[PDB]
Amino acid sequence: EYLSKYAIDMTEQARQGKLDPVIGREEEIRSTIRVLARRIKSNPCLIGEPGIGKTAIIEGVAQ
Amino acid sequence: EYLSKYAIDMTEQARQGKLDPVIGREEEIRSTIRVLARRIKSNPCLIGEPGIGKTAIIEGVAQRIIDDDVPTILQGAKLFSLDLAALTAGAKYKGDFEERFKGVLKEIEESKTLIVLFIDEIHMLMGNGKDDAANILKPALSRGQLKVIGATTNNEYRSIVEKDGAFERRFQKIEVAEPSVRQTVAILRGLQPKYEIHHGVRILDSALVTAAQLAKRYLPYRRLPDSALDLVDISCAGVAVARDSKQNVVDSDTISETAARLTGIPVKKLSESENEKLIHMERDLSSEVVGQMDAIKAVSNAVRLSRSGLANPRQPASFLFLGLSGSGKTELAKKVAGFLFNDEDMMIRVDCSELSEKYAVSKLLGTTAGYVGYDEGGFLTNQLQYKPYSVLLFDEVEKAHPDVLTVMLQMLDDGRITSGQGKTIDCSNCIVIMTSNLGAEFINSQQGSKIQESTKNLVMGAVRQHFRPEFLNRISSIVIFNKLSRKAIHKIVDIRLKEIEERFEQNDKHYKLNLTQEAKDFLAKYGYSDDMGARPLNRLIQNEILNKLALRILKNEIKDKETVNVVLEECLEVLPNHE
Amino acid sequence: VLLFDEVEKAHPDVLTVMLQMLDDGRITSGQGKTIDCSNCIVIMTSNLGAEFINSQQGSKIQESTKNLVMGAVRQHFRPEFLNRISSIVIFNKLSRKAIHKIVDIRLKEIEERFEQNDKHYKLNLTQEAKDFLAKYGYSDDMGARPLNRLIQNEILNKLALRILKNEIKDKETVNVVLEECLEVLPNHE
């Protein structure tokens, strides 16, 4: 329910190989992950140019 | 009971240790209490910038209650946080949601201790422009009953309540002050054990100090309580991440490093192992820009001060590069961006020559509210806001209207360039390079290679007669470029030829060149013209070498590995021949 | 407290806002609601006196200079504005006397702002470097600001380099080596 209706399980899509592999971006991945590892306000946000790989970063997180 | 569905018992959470202990803010908590202790309209609201800590005050209220620091009047009390859900759980069946809300109020006044209700995000109380707002807290506030406490920002408050009117009467505004760095550090120390527990790490006292001061210097858009905590917690997380990745302590350098990861400011990477590249920045820049050593040194020094932390926190580097066209004023600046970012395109180029009086400021800052287009920021907010460590380049500043230069005065001192909408950019972390040709009339005195005295002074004269003193006074350094002497030309030729090879995307465009003395000499003599600086070399190469190459390529007289031959002029070798 | 950096660049519409601010400061916002800021402090600045004070004829503003400056002020702003200002003050120029005191202050300021002062200034200025900075940095017609440039150029750049080279571990040696002396800070370790 709810989440299963209004959201995509990105993790499973990654498991299924439906998402592109992500190449490099280790520093950005580490930063994102590090923020998620925070206790309070663990909410990173990817800010940048229109199309530089922000989806790719999140897919990288799933992978 | 509606409170069991729609509200959180803040005092329970305080009792359970789920809320952070409050540090400082003694007057604000006392003020809050004095208002709650009122008999009539006892309804304070904490107002202040987001990131200030006003929620922490509310947590403080809960803590004061748990430990009875609360005056007799309010000791027999409970604190609940009302969710929006009381109303936002669905309005299906008009009026039901208002009834749930009233239901909550009945429970609050009815006997069971002085239940005080906390309203988070009080802007929601505005309802649909009054109308649907009904009696949100009407009779409550009008009788000093059903006491509430709330919190919101100035930005919100400015509309919501000021637009409502009724809520201003009913609520008592209290400002919550942003803490000083001193106070900020105290907060961090108070929360230190929470973070040590949160991540299984120790925090160095110096680290706590560092985050607070560091945050003030590099996180200008976020208030100190938050910013300092963001740095401490992210640093602690970094250590925890490292632990799982495969030292359990945060130090000042952990913080500085991470801050750089979040702010983009390389200074705080503390890249001591790379000091050799920085130390030899002069050398590296000289591999592209020939001569002009004083300019190169001026830059290297500015960068070094920044990287050492010594550069004044409020003083963007600021330069005027003066000289004849072709002197490398622009090229140096680009090369610097090259060096600093390994990317010349990092630079925020501003065509400052395209700045007549009436428009210039809107191209840089953008317009205020009302006027067509609100992408405020034009070039500078829109770029400086994201790249605080960037290099600004204002090509031909002498042509910029004095009015915009007036604006540049803010930028050039304290970095307080503000957007059209009133937001402060805070670009003191940047480097600002401006260029002009004002000294051309004196560089054309031909008084030496290294510009000689008198000539330099006459140039300074031209500058002083062009820009207002207040502008010039904000320039860190005024640099006059050197005349490109024959020896400079020889060195330049070596460099330009290399670039030609770097522009060769494919291996059918490739020189062996040959004539490394003959062509070098030819080109050096022909490009040795004060009147164009290094620039005619670009024309020499194109006209004597590349135009011909283009034809040889079209005629398939070249496959790869090209040779230049001497003509009594230059020409190219035919390798294959129409193959 | 408000600061208007070059209030003189204001167009009459702003100056009108300021007329209200300075006398019955019930400033009406665009929203339509007033502010009422009579309890604030309003500090405004202008460069109009530059044409006379740059004569350098006396560091304390002289009466002739004063009147010429105020002339420009009265030409520029309507008197209606000027008549609502509690005081108009023309700042005195930085006599060499002042410069010596300022150099000390600036050097201490540098220490104060130096974050975590592992490296810290010993400021072994001695009278000789005090005079060096105070004397050679006294570009009278630009006020005290050039002192900063001088310090950055002569002291901080060298210091930063020695820091990058790790030739300094802490503290900060100072001396004068011999305007051609360029002060020049010594090595450390």
Ligand SMILES: Nc1ncnc2c1ncn2[C@@H]1O[C@H](COP(=O)(O)OP(=O)(O)OP(O)(O)=S)[C@@H](O)[C@H]1O
């Ligand atoms: N490092 C990377 N590894 C793999 N694919 C990448 C990488 N960076 C970018 N991409 C490509 O970027 C494409 C999707 O781009 P996005 O990340 O959505 O662009 P964007 O940054 O989301 O821009 P928006 O916000 O969606 S316009 C994918 O098709 C990826 O192949």
Ligand SMILES: Nc1ncnc2c1ncn2[C@@H]1O[C@H](COP(=O)(O)OP(=O)(O)OP(O)(O)=S)[C@@H](O)[C@H]1O
């Ligand atoms: N003085 C303080 N004492 C204890 N904790 C504090 C203090 N100041 C900040 N904090 C911590 O950092 C946060 C301060 O931010 P909050 O007050 O929650 O956010 P805020 O000020 O409400 O901004 P909004 O409007 O709710 S985003 C708190 O959540 C505490 O964890």
Ligand SMILES: Nc1ncnc2c1ncn2[C@@H]1O[C@H](COP(=O)(O)OP(=O)(O)OP(O)(O)=S)[C@@H](O)[C@H]1O
């Ligand atoms: N000192 C130098 N060393 C190497 N190349 C140089 C040098 N000076 C100029 N150039 C060449 O000059 C070209 C770029 O022109 P610039 O010299 O920047 O003109 P500029 O005067 O710097 O910018 P302006 O003021 O609009 S001409 C590049 O192709 C550089 O290679």
